[PDB]
Write a protein that binds this DNA or RNA. Structure first.
Lengths: 128, 272, 37, 136
RNA sequence: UACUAAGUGGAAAAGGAUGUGAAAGUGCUAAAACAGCAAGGAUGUUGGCUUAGAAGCAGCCAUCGUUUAAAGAGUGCGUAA
RNA sequence: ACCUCGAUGUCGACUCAUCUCAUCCUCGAGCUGAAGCAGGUUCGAAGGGUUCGGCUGUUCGCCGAUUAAAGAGAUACGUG
RNA sequence: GGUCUUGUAGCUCAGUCGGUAGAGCAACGGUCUGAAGAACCGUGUGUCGGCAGUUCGAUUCUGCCCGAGACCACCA
């Protein structure tokens, strides 16, 4: 409920996280400071009622799908999934699988790799 | 009526004394009375007062947009003018190339190398083209950003004074404007409609009623404000349209965004 | 209430009924009401 | 004017269109064919209306084959005329439809498109259309 | 021995029909068929493009891959998002 | 080309009007791209009603004004 | 329904019964011209109404169609 998909920068515009009762500044400061190490990469974030919904936040473990674009030797997204630009090594895919290992609701290397393949078969890059 | 316009000016000048927050002008663009106030009932009672106290009885008008004109490339041109007038005869043959392009304005190029025309007739045709660029074939709207390149010309014996070249150039420009099927241009404006998401669905509905541009939303620091690219002609009724659907809970701004070629839905109205 | 010569479910909710051997079509939208056939 | 180029006679006996097929009782080049359960005259107007109804919903991949042609014609006497002057001039061309014959066939396109096209074009003619599948 | 619910019979066309009775091909099911009901229906996934905002769901490329009886860029509804 | 021409009173105007709804209004009601007012569409529905003047022989037709609305088809386009 | 005619260039016109599409004007260049009128040479335009045949070959010859033009079609 009221899930937000936002970047690692500010949190002012998104009318899904700060539209439940959490103050804007008091936590946008904390997010822009703590997540500054991960600013520029999207982190899907979710919320729930604590006892009045004054402050109850959590963020999913960051998926590499946003960085799968640059992993695909690209600098900006592509409409078609049948276009090939560059080649991606296997070590990058292994690091992607291990990075989202605690992110994916399951845990095993083959499933994570196949899921990345599935979300990349549509993105425009075929994983190795 | 002319007397109606004069008494409108007398009423509005005195009405400005009673209410100086509106502005009154005569448009050099259309000649209508341009009255600028802030609301439906406000303008209604303004006209009521000027028809009761000042006894000015006039019907409602209709705002319009100047819809400037551009066009495509011409063949070269073929301009001729042969008439026995002007204290003598007048003969002139001209062929320039006149290319419209919204990047460069009037650039005149001269390419006389065999002596087909003296330099005394270069400035005349330059001036003729410069002053004839101001009118168009669709509705007289200016034909801007066109470059001229003189290539060929011919004059007669001791006849054929200067004005023959200018008249021939004007005829050639008229024919060229007719043949290339010109298109029109209107100033599209950015409208920053302000509403704290209370009437956002109404905003989309009202925008779409004018074929619209609804694509998303953005927030300014205490509210959400939506950018809409809107034509100028449909904004006049859109003011009361937006006011009505938001129930008087929305304000915006109207500024010149950019000049965009008129859609064919506007173009079909010019053919006669 | 409208009259035609053919009645098939135009929408996914346009069910067909025969009240008193009188054929009608009923759907979620009140635009989608007809009776004949 | 779906006119046969050479016509030795243009004023024949009108038509007796009732009768069974004299050939082309099978779908040869197409995959769905239009069978007629009742013969009739068809003027060029109705022929063209049905043809354009089929062609509007005809896809780029599909191809159509005609199995009929207005080999016959029809005259028309104007109003307020006393009976007997010979015969009128042929005003148009008439395709004769024997019952049990196939008039049009379609192929090279998915089945849904074919059946939808046939059901769509079925109401353009008084003849009770019937669908027929691929034959040999 | 059967049909009919229209007084059809005892007036009619194209078309429509989830109509009735019957016949035959085949499937599922008492280890419980279609249900309803009680439920889950998740995941990369605002996948990427589009318009600052179109991102389960305007639309477009792929239209898949995992946990898995099962989960669909989702079955539709509802948003400019 | 049909009974009827050893006659089948036919144009128009007034009067009797009557019938029918494939209803114009009044009415009930459904739906809507039906905010209200103002609507549109549709089913039922004949109980009742559906204006007057100028012009042309004129019902036709034109014009003007007016009413909830100022219907249409029939009776030898009824009525010597 | 017949009796027939008409449609050709940007305007109005002929159309070697098949052997071409043509001036003038609309409009342009040049030439002569006390000036200017003046006249001449020639730039340019042509599904010859459309479709089919016929014809060595079609605008022409034939048929059909469309747009237009005149002849009658409810009585003792």
């Amino acid at each position: 409920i009221a899930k937000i998909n936002l970047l690692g920068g500010q949190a002012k515009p998104g009318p899904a996280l700060a539209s439940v009762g959490i103050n804007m500044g008091e936590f946008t400061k904390q997010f822009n400071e703590k997540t500054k190490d991960k600013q520029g990469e999207m982190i899907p974030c979710v919320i729930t009622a604590y006892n009045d919904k004054s402050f109850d936040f959590i963020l999913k473990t960051t998926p590499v799908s946003i960085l799968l674009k640059q992993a695909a030797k690209l600098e900006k997204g592509a409409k078609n999934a049948k276009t090939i630009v560059g080649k991606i090594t296997m070590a990058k895919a292994k690091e992607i699988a291990q990075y989202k290992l605690v992110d994916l609701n399951a845990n095993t290397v083959e499933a994570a790799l196949k899921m990345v393949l599935g979300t990349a078969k549509q993105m425009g890059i075929e994983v190795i | 009526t002319k007397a109606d316009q004069e008494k409108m000016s007398i009423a509005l000048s005195k009405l400005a004394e009673e209410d100086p927050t509106f502005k009154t002008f005569t448009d050099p663009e259309t000649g209508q009375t341009i009255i600028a106030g802030m609301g439906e009932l406000h303008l209604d009672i303004l006209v009521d007062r000027m028809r009761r106290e000042f006894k000015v009885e006039v019907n409602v008008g209709a705002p319009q947009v100047s819809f400037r004109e551009t066009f495509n490339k011409e063949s070269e041109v073929e301009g001729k003018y042969i008439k026995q007038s002007g204290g003598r005869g007048q003969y002139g043959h001209v062929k320039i190339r006149f290319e419209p392009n919204k990047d460069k304005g009037f650039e005149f190029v001269d390419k006389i190398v065999g002596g087909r025309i003296p330099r005394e007739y270069i400035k005349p045709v330059q001036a003729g083209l410069e002053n004839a660029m101001a009118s168009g074939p669709l509705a007289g709207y200016p034909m801007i950003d066109i470059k001229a390149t003189l290539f060929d010309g011919s004059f007669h014996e001791v006849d054929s004074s200067e004005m023959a070249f200018k008249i021939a150039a004007s005829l050639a420009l008229k024919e060229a404007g007719k043949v290339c099927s010109p298109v029109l241009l209107e100033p599209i404006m950015a409208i920053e409609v302000t509403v704290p998401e209370q009437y956002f669905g109404d905003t989309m509905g009202d925008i779409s009623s004018r074929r619209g541009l609804i694509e998303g939303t953005e927030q300014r620091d205490n509210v959400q404000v939506i950018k809409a690219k809107v034509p100028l002609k449909e904004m006049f009724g859109y003011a009361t349209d937006l006011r009505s659907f938001s129930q008087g809970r929305g304000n915006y701004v109207m500024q010149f965004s950019h000049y965009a070629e008129t859609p064919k839905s506007v173009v079909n109205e010019i053919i006669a | 209430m409208k009259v035609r010569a053919s009645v098939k479910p135009i929408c996914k909710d346009c069910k067909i009924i025969k009240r008193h051997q009188i054929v009608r079509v009923i759907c979620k939208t009140q635009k989608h009401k007809q009776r004949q056939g | 004017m779906l006119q046969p180029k050479r016509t030795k006679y243009r004023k024949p006996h009108n038509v007796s269109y009732e009768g069974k097929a004299k050939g082309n009782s099978y779908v040869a080049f197409g995959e769905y064919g239009l069978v007629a359960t009742k013969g009739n005259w068809i003027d060029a107007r109705a022929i063209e209306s049905a043809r354009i109804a089929i062609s509007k919903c005809l896809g780029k991949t599909g191809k159509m084959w005609i199995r009929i042609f207005p080999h016959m014609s029809k005259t028309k006497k104007p109003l307020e005329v006393r009976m007997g002057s010979g015969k009128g001039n042929p005003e148009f061309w008439v395709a004769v439809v024997k019952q049990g014959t196939v008039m049009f066939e379609v192929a090279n396109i998915p089945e849904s498109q074919m059946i939808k096209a046939l059901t769509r074009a079925g109401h353009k003619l008084p003849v009770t259309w019937k669908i027929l599948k691929r034959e040999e």
